[PDB]
């Protein structure tokens, strides 16, 4: 009854039904049990939440919920009336119930209300019926909970959904102090850790949150989410989460890369970590995930080794990539022209391996995988070309004065220009 798997909860292009089916197959292939549907930019999930699914949309949602049972993965349907709704208006409540009614007849048993990412105070009308902001959300959550006959699993994502998002601090919050106390115990609470993207979740921090929440929370985990940075992708192991945590949480749902095929390592390494304590080593999980991924693709394990190292984790590059960095850092500092030449050549080779990994990746069989990742790898290949080129220039300079134009030499457009003027 412990929930572990994926939440499709990012901003941007959501997945299509053919990706979400391929998602389920993988989930039980590796023994995870849950899927939360909360893609921020499906218009009907959040942006136009009162609105009924169309006839072609109904067909699609039913086929999906079907495949969920066909794979015995539990399907949770989220909705997000956060920024819009009038809590104290009962037609507003009715439309909310009408909407959830529509989805239950698609085959759907598990439900969730999300109140992440919205303005901290209500309209003139709301200031009356409810004493505080936190009071208003619970009213409808509970009113809803019961309406569905108090279903199997029903999640609640708070406005203050992580440590830094708790005012003034985490255990001194009127908001979270209200929620714990006035929210039904048949209802789950989502939490993302100390931050939105958490480098690590200490066992202590959950005990602390669990006491103000008066439950064991389900983690919405942003460790592999890439929606907040165009250049960024994350193929590292599930890391910074103690196996010690499984006893203290009702689940973990991973919010992963927008690009579906990139999420292989993300979901697999999460799978093993949960298999561990239902300790665990990231450096090995990755070794398991990467060899098995290599099946699906020409490209070597060494190539993927390099690939995940270049696109590792939101606060950590991978071994081969950290090394390539400090190396280029030393080389540019020490600019004598003893050993310096020795290390230029060694670096220049390490560059050619990126060019290598890119080539064999493009020549590969599995075209869906290539595409989800193409721009991410083309970018790294091109910067490493300039970086090889630049080290080349720095060596061939005791014998030249030639100072260091197509557009891809200066980069990032207008965004890049503003970015470079920031301290």
């Amino acid at each position: 009854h412990f929930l572990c798997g994926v939440v499709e909860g990012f901003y941007g292009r959501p997945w299509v039904m053919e990706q979400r089916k391929e998602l389920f197959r993988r989930l039980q292939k590796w023994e995870l049990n849950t899927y939360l549907y909360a893609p921020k930019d499906d218009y009907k999930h959040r942006m136009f939440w009162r609105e009924m699914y169309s006839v072609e949309e109904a067909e699609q949602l039913m086929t999906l919920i079907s495949a969920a049972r066909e794979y015995e993965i539990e399907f949770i349907y989220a909705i997000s009336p956060g920024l819009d709704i009038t809590f104290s208006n009962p037609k507003e409540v009715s439309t909310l119930k009408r909407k959830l009614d529509q989805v239950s007849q698609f085959g759907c048993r598990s439900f969730a209300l999300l109140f992440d990412n919205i303005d901290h105070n209500m309209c003139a009308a709301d200031k009356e019926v409810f004493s505080s902001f936190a009071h208003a959300q619970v009213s409808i959550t509970n009113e809803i909970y019961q309406y569905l006959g108090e279903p199997e699993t029903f999640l609640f994502c708070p406005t203050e959904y992580c440590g830094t998002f708790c005012y003034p601090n985490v255990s001194q919050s009127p908001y979270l102090r209200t929620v714990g106390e006035k929210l039904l115990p048949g209802i789950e609470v989502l939490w993302t850790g100390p931050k939105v993207v958490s480098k690590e979740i200490p066992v202590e921090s959950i005990e602390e949150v669990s006491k103000i929440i008066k439950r064991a929370p389900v983690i919405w985990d942003n460790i592999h989410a890439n929606d907040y940075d165009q250049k960024r992708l994350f193929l590292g192991p599930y890391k910074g989460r103690s196996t010690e945590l499984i006893p203290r949480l009702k689940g973990v749902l991973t919010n992963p890369n927008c690009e579906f095929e990139a999420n292989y390592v993300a979901i697999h390494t999460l799978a093993t970590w949960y298999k561990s304590n239902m300790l665990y080593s990231p450096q090995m999980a990755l070794k398991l995930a990467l060899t098995e991924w290599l099946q699906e693709f020409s490209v070597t394990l060494e190539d993927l080794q390099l690939l995940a190292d270049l696109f590792y984790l939101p606060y950590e590059h991978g071994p081969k990539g950290a090394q390539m960095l400090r190396e280029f850092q030393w080389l540019r500092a020490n600019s004598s022209v003893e050993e310096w030449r020795s290390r230029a050549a060694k670096f220049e080779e390490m560059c050619g391996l990126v060019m290598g990994m890119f080539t064999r990746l493009s020549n590969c069989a599995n075209r869906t995988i290539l595409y989800d990742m193409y721009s991410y790898v083309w970018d790294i290949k091109s910067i490493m070309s300039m970086v090889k080129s630049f080290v080349q220039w720095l060596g061939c300079r005791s014998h030249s004065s030639a100072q260091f134009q197509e557009p891809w030499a200066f980069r990032g457009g207008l965004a890049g220009e503003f970015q470079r003027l920031l301290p």
Partner: peptide
């Protein structure tokens, strides 16, 4: 993350 986001607001409007």
């Amino acid at each position: 993350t986001l607001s409007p």
